[PDB]
Each structure stands twice: as structure tokens, then as C-alpha cells.
Design a protein around this motif. Structure first.
Motif, mmCIF file in Angstrom:
data_model
loop_
_atom_site.group_PDB
_atom_site.id
_atom_site.type_symbol
_atom_site.label_atom_id
_atom_site.label_comp_id
_atom_site.label_asym_id
_atom_site.label_seq_id
_atom_site.Cartn_x
_atom_site.Cartn_y
_atom_site.Cartn_z
ATOM 1 N N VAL A 182 11.812 -0.422 -10.112
ATOM 2 C CA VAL A 182 11.134 -0.930 -8.923
ATOM 3 C C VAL A 182 9.646 -0.927 -9.138
ATOM 4 O O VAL A 182 8.994 -1.934 -8.914
ATOM 5 C CB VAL A 182 11.467 -0.104 -7.685
ATOM 6 C CG1 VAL A 182 10.820 -0.718 -6.446
ATOM 7 C CG2 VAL A 182 12.971 -0.041 -7.461
ATOM 8 N N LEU B 117 0.846 -1.199 0.000
ATOM 9 C CA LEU B 117 0.000 0.000 0.000
ATOM 10 C C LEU B 117 0.879 1.246 0.000
ATOM 11 O O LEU B 117 2.091 1.150 0.179
ATOM 12 C CB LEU B 117 -0.943 0.016 1.213
ATOM 13 C CG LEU B 117 -2.139 -0.939 1.196
ATOM 14 C CD1 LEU B 117 -2.934 -0.845 -0.085
ATOM 15 C CD2 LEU B 117 -1.756 -2.375 1.465
ATOM 16 N N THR B 118 0.267 2.417 -0.166
ATOM 17 C CA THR B 118 0.952 3.718 -0.132
ATOM 18 C C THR B 118 0.183 4.771 0.650
ATOM 19 O O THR B 118 -1.030 4.871 0.513
ATOM 20 C CB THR B 118 1.251 4.281 -1.523
ATOM 21 O OG1 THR B 118 0.082 4.396 -2.287
ATOM 22 C CG2 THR B 118 2.205 3.411 -2.304
ATOM 23 N N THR C 129 -0.559 7.461 -8.121
ATOM 24 C CA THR C 129 -0.754 6.413 -7.121
ATOM 25 C C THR C 129 -2.173 6.459 -6.600
ATOM 26 O O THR C 129 -2.607 7.513 -6.137
ATOM 27 C CB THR C 129 0.194 6.605 -5.943
ATOM 28 O OG1 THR C 129 0.129 7.919 -5.464
ATOM 29 C CG2 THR C 129 1.628 6.322 -6.305
ATOM 30 N N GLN D 54 7.299 -4.242 -9.124
ATOM 31 C CA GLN D 54 6.214 -4.459 -8.172
ATOM 32 C C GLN D 54 4.876 -4.639 -8.864
ATOM 33 O O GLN D 54 4.065 -5.469 -8.489
ATOM 34 C CB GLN D 54 6.137 -3.291 -7.192
ATOM 35 C CG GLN D 54 7.250 -3.384 -6.147
ATOM 36 C CD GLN D 54 7.137 -4.631 -5.280
ATOM 37 O OE1 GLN D 54 6.079 -5.208 -5.088
ATOM 38 N NE2 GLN D 54 8.219 -5.111 -4.726
ATOM 39 N N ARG E 197 0.914 -12.574 -8.690
ATOM 40 C CA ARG E 197 0.281 -12.983 -7.433
ATOM 41 C C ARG E 197 -1.237 -12.799 -7.476
ATOM 42 O O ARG E 197 -1.944 -13.625 -6.908
ATOM 43 C CB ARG E 197 0.945 -12.310 -6.222
ATOM 44 C CG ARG E 197 2.411 -12.732 -6.055
ATOM 45 C CD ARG E 197 3.039 -12.286 -4.732
ATOM 46 N NE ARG E 197 2.631 -13.124 -3.588
ATOM 47 C CZ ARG E 197 3.287 -14.140 -3.063
ATOM 48 N NH1 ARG E 197 4.410 -14.562 -3.530
ATOM 49 N NH2 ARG E 197 2.795 -14.761 -2.042
ATOM 50 N N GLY F 216 -11.348 4.749 -5.038
ATOM 51 C CA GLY F 216 -9.965 5.111 -4.772
ATOM 52 C C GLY F 216 -9.598 6.493 -5.307
ATOM 53 O O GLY F 216 -10.109 6.913 -6.345
ATOM 54 N N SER G 254 -11.789 -1.123 -8.903
ATOM 55 C CA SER G 254 -13.140 -1.131 -9.446
ATOM 56 C C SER G 254 -13.872 -2.430 -9.172
ATOM 57 O O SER G 254 -15.059 -2.423 -8.865
ATOM 58 C CB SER G 254 -13.124 -0.854 -10.939
ATOM 59 O OG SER G 254 -14.453 -0.661 -11.361
ATOM 60 N N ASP H 53 -4.466 5.857 -3.530
ATOM 61 C CA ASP H 53 -4.294 5.777 -2.084
ATOM 62 C C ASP H 53 -4.782 4.443 -1.496
ATOM 63 O O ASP H 53 -4.052 3.803 -0.742
ATOM 64 C CB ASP H 53 -4.963 6.975 -1.397
ATOM 65 C CG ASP H 53 -6.495 6.952 -1.359
ATOM 66 O OD1 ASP H 53 -7.141 6.467 -2.315
ATOM 67 O OD2 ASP H 53 -7.057 7.357 -0.321
ATOM 68 N N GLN H 54 -5.995 4.002 -1.828
ATOM 69 C CA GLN H 54 -6.611 2.823 -1.236
ATOM 70 C C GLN H 54 -6.159 1.524 -1.883
ATOM 71 O O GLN H 54 -5.708 0.639 -1.164
ATOM 72 C CB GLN H 54 -8.128 2.951 -1.268
ATOM 73 C CG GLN H 54 -8.626 3.879 -0.168
ATOM 74 C CD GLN H 54 -9.831 4.682 -0.613
ATOM 75 O OE1 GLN H 54 -10.958 4.261 -0.485
ATOM 76 N NE2 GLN H 54 -9.657 5.841 -1.163
ATOM 77 N N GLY I 42 -3.540 1.024 -3.683
ATOM 78 C CA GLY I 42 -2.084 0.982 -3.746
ATOM 79 C C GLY I 42 -1.552 0.635 -5.131
ATOM 80 O O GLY I 42 -0.587 -0.110 -5.247
ATOM 81 N N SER J 177 2.391 11.641 -8.917
ATOM 82 C CA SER J 177 3.754 11.549 -8.401
ATOM 83 C C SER J 177 4.788 11.911 -9.466
ATOM 84 O O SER J 177 5.035 11.168 -10.417
ATOM 85 C CB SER J 177 4.030 10.157 -7.858
ATOM 86 O OG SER J 177 5.344 10.151 -7.350
#
Ligand code: ZN
Lengths: 94, 76, 345
Positions: free
Chosen positions: C113, B43-44, C193, C117, C124, C228, C222, C195-196, C198, C233
Motif C-alpha cells: 500500500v 495526509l497523516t 512519516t 501510494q 500525479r 516538516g 522542501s 506530519d505536514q 504526508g 513508524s
DNA sequence: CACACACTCTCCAATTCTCTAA
DNA sequence: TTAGAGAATTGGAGAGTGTGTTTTTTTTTTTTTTTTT
């Protein structure tokens, strides 16, 4: 045609694999209590595990809200009752 | 005046707790945290206060949620 | 409304000719393939722009015509509509770029990075018991270099010779650089980004203005019907150096009783700060309309303003021994004095 | 003109209230 | 007394309507007043 139906907690989500079984597997490992900590840190160690798992199951809702929802669903659903009594029946059997 | 003083010391203690929760630099300073979690995923959360305090980070991650459960509330 | 027409071009042929050119071509007549070796410098991060010499593509087509296989007139496509071919050459490069051979120190970069991710999150998730815009990962700027005289990109134009009929073409323009902007970042890809959830989402920008996203649309946001919030950034955005310059025609070129007209030049990427005010220069570039956007686009009507995207720049204009070559002639004082303004007697 | 924001209208389903039988 | 089926009210999706937005502004001439020319 319709509006999209609301996503909502139900046993078909709450009983599903990352769910109550994930709690029963991971929580006894990840939640640690000691009198060596203050009560407020112990309470926070409990609450972390459940807050992250509630975020994984139902990111829509806040933690207090998720607790009010779980109370109403565990009160109403017969399959959720059957699952819970089944857990207790295992511990009585042993 | 003693009664006023004791109450100002209680409001001072409350504002001290608010100051301990507030930004040590300006609103735009922009530092951004990523929280690794189990299932090895991210998360962020924004804000310099969240970088150092794990409990504040998780409190902020819940504070931002845009849902609220509808409350229920209640003659001459 | 939207009819359609039979143009004598097929970008599926020309994409195949371009990739066939990049992997094959060597200037061995100077006695591995030129652009492969170049791309190795790009993959090792020793290089940040790719210059495509149009004069090479002639030698490609000449060799292919001599082999009796009719290469599809590619220079006459990329002089005639250069803008679209910046996209095709970037696709042809990315499909062919070799894996690095020097160590990069990879984890010093942010996008290595973020995209990793994002890769792992997709595995996953998708275990379940484009990926993102390619412009984000292009570490290089493409530029065409025009034909030398050996054809319209060869003949340098005065600013008034650049009629509206030239829009989209690769041209060469001759003049003084009259003024130059300070260098500012333009965006190309904007990273946000959520927030919720991620999760990272990208907006790509291709206009003087854009509208930000604000509301999340990641699958897992969604699907969980979670409203979200997206925050921009700059750390993960892709910018390019942008510098706007103005060019004016030379006093020799202005016809009797007119006034020296000007063009706006946009220089993007590594080519920036190659221009200085008072330079006499030939800039080769892609001539374009700058379309008004939003309300001004309605009221301005069909009257498009215009600019030139710089592509290459030609300026119009031994030490430690040469001082001894003076001294050893002797009488330096009187000869240096007589050599101040020799036209005055 | 047209495309975002501001603001109102309307319908639909989600939740809680209320009554009945197990 | 618990728990489950049927009735009423509220939330908010989303459809619909309506409004504002370009934008500049020094330059060059003509005048009338103070003073420094
Ligand atoms: Zn999201």
C-alpha cells in the motif's frame, strides 16, 4: 552563496491553476449549507474546503495566518484586483 | 460558598470539554490516521482522538505547523 | 589520505558471471534452472531464504572451462571476500526474479500500500501540466553454503586458528555453542512519516548505532519550504531477527596449558534459533570486524573487536515396527535389563 | 582525535512604517 | 482618499564556537565479630 529566499504568497502562486480557479470550480459543489444543521456544523463545512485548499497552496502557514496574508495581498496587487473585477464583470455581463 | 460552587461548576464544564478532547488510553499507544483528500492524495495525523473526529484531525493538522506570522504590538 | 590500486578483480565481470549463473544453472546431472525455480517459491511467498551452494559454482566454472570460456574464478573471489558478494547476489536476484504465479493476498501487506501510494503520488505530481532503497523490498535472506571436500571453507577451524588474516573470508568454525541471546529485532530500513507533507522517507542502517532524521527532506516539503516533522513508524520499518551466540573451542583442540577461547556469532534472518547451548557444531560464516562507533571508536584505537556472521550450520549429532521387532524376539524383560549398561558385568 | 547538541554572533532581506503624488 | 514609493526595524539562516562522550563494579583475599556451631 545566499540564503534561500523565503517562499511567500503572491499572485504568481495565488492566481495559478490550482488556486482561485480551483475554488471557483469546486467550492459551489463541495460547500453545503442548511438550517437542518446547527450553525457550528455549517461553519465547519465551509471552513473544511478552504482549510484543505489553503494547505494545498501554502502548507507553510496556519489558516488564520493565510487569511491575514490574503488580505494584505488582495489589498496591494493590481493584477489580483484586475482578476477579481474581471470575475464580477462576467456576472454583471450575464 | 455558593459563589465558589458556581465557579467550580464552570471550571468543571471546561475540564469536561478538555477530557472530551483527551486520550482515552496512554501517550505511547501510537494509533496513526491517514486522511484521503481531493486530488486523491494523503495526509497523516497521530493520536487516537483524531481517528474518530474529522474536525479534530484537521485542527491537529493545522496545530502542528511550525510557521507563525510575526505579530505587531504597541510614559510617566 | 586516499590513494588507489590495481586489484585483479572486476565486479562488472563477476556481476555478469553471477547473473549468468543464476539464470542458466540446473543440476540436471542428478538424472528448469535451479535458482529460477527457487525464486518462484520466493515470489509466491512459499520461501524466505536463498541458499547458494558454492559447490554448484564449481560445476558452473567446470562446464564453462569445458566449453572453453574462462569463467572469472568466482569461488576464489567469494571465499576470499564473502561480504561484498551478499550485495551482488541480491542485485543479481532482484534483476531476475519472476512475477508471482500464485495469488499473494497482496493488500494484507503494508508496504504494498505504502509504495503504491508513493507510486501514484509521483505520477500525479510529475504530470505537471533508486525510487527508495531496495533492501526495503527484499522479502528473502541470502546465505552461502561452503565447499564440501572434493578450498579454505572446507577445513573446519578451532577458534584459535582464526587469525586476523582471515577477516572478510568465508570460514568454517568448530566448537560448542556456550550461550545464546533471546531473539531481538534489529532494524535494517527505518520508515518515517512526515506530519505536514504526508510523505514517507527511509533511513537505511548498517551499524551498531544510527542517528534519526527528525527534519523532512521530501521534494514537496522542501520545495514548499515547510519545516516538516518526521516520526518513526515501526509498522512500515523493515526488521530482521537478530540473535547473538558465543562459540568455544573443543577440549581436544586446546594446546597444553592454554584456556578455551571464544567467538561471537551473529545469526540474522531465517537461520535464527538453529543454535542451542551445548550443541557441538560446525558454523560456516563470514568473519568480520565490528567497528566501534561514536566516541568509543576514537579511544579504542585500531584494535577492532570481531564476530562471525552465520551462513550455514552443521550439527555434529521404522519406529512403529521396531517395537514389534523387539517383542517377536521374546524374553524382553531379561534382555532389556542385561542391555542396561552392558559394559558392567 | 570527531561528531552531535547547546548557545552566541552577524548579516541579510522581508515586512511594516511613514511620506508623497495621483 | 487611495495607492505606491522610499526608510527603518525585526527574524532567522547559518556560520561559528565550545563541550562532553568510554564505563566497570564482580571477584578474591584478608580482617575481625557473632553465632551458630
Ligand atoms: Zn514533509
Amino acid at each position: 552563496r545566499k540564503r534561500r529566499p523565503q517562499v511567500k504568497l503572491t499572485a504568481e502562486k495565488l492566481l495559478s491553476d490550482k488556486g482561485l480557479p480551483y475554488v471557483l470550480k469546486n467550492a459551489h459543489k463541495r460547500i453545503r449549507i442548511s438550517s437542518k444543521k446547527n450553525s457550528y456544523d455549517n461553519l465547519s463545512n465551509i471552513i473544511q474546503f478552504y482549510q484543505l485548499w489553503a494547505h494545498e497552496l501554502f502548507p507553510k502557514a496556519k489558516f488564520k495566518d493565510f487569511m491575514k496574508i490574503c488580505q494584505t495581498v488582495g489589498k496591494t496587487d493590481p493584477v489580483l484586483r484586475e482578476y477579481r473585477v474581471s470575475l464580477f464583470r462576467d456576472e454583471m455581463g450575464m | 460558598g455558593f459563589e465558589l460552587s458556581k465557579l467550580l461548576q464552570k471550571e468543571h464544564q471546561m475540564r469536561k470539554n478538555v477530557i472530551k478532547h483527551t486520550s482515552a488510553r496512554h501517550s505511547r499507544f501510537g494509533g496513526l490516521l491517514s486522511i484521503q483528500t481531493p486530488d486523491k492524495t494523503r495526509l497523516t495525523v497521530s493520536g487516537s482522538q483524531a481517528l474518530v473526529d474529522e474536525k479534530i484531525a484537521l485542527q491537529k493538522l493545522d496545530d502542528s505547523k511550525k510557521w507563525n506570522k510575526r505579530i505587531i504590538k504597541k510614559e510617566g | 589520505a586516499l590513494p588507489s590500486i590495481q586489484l585483479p578483480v572486476d565486479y562488472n565481470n563477476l556481476f555478469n558471471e553471477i547473473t549468468d549463473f543464476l539464470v542458466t544453472f540446473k543440476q540436471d546431472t542428478l538424472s528448469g534452472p535451479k535458482y529460477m525455480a527457487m525464486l518462484q517459491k520466493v515470489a509466491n511467498r512459499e520461501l524466505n531464504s536463498v541458499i547458494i551452494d558454492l559447490d554448484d559454482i564449481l560445476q558452473y566454472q567446470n562446464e564453462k572451462f569445458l566449453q572453453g570460456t574462462q569463467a572469472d574464478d568466482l569461488v576464489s573471489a567469494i571465499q576470499q571476500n564473502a561480504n561484498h558478494f551478499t550485495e551482488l547476489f541480491c542485485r543479481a536476484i532482484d534483476n531476475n526474479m519472476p512475477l508471482p504465479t500464485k495469488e499473494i493476498d497482496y493488500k494484507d501487506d503494508v508496504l504494498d500500500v505504502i509504495l503504491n501510494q508513493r507510486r501514484l503520488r509521483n505520477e500525479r505530481m510529475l504530470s505537471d501540466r533508486e525510487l527508495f532503497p531496495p533492501n526495503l523490498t527484499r522479502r528473502y535472506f541470502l546465505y552461502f553454503k561452503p565447499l564440501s571436500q572434493n578450498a579454505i571453507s572446507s577445513k573446519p577451524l578451532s577458534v584459535r586458528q582464526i587469525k586476523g588474516d582471515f577477516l572478510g573470508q568465508l570460514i568454517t568454525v568448530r566448537g560448542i555453542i556456550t550461550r545464546v541471546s533471546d531473539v531481538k529485532p534489529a532494524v535494517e530500513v527505518i520508515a518515517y512519516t512526515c506530519d505536514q507533507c504526508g510523505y514517507e522517507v527511509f533511513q537505511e542502517v548498517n551499524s551498531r548505532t544510527f542517528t534519526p532524521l527528525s527534519e523532512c527532506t521530501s521534494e514537496e516539503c522542501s520545495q514548499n519550504q515547510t519545516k516538516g516533522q518526521l516520526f518513526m513508524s515501526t509498522r512500515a520499518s523493515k526488521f530482521s531477527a537478530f540473535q547473538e551466540c558465543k562459540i568455544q573451542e573443543l577440549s581436544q583442540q586446546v594446546p597444553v596449558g592454554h584456556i578455551p577461547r571464544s567467538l561471537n556469532i551473529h545469526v540474522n534472518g531465517t537461520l535464527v534459533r538453529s543454535l542451542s547451548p551445548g550443541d557441538i557444531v560446525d558454523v560456516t560464516g563470514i568473519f568480520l570486524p565490528a567497528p566501534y562507533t561514536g566516541f568509543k571508536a576514537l579511544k579504542a584505537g585500531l584494535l577492532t573487536e570481531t564476530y562471525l556472521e552465520a551462513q550455514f550450520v552443521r550439527q555434529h549429532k521404522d519406529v512403529e515396527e521396531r517395537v514389534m521387532e523387539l517383542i517377536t524376539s521374546g524374553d524382553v524383560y531379561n534382555r532389556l535389563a542385561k542391555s542396561i549398561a552392558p559394559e558392567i558385568y
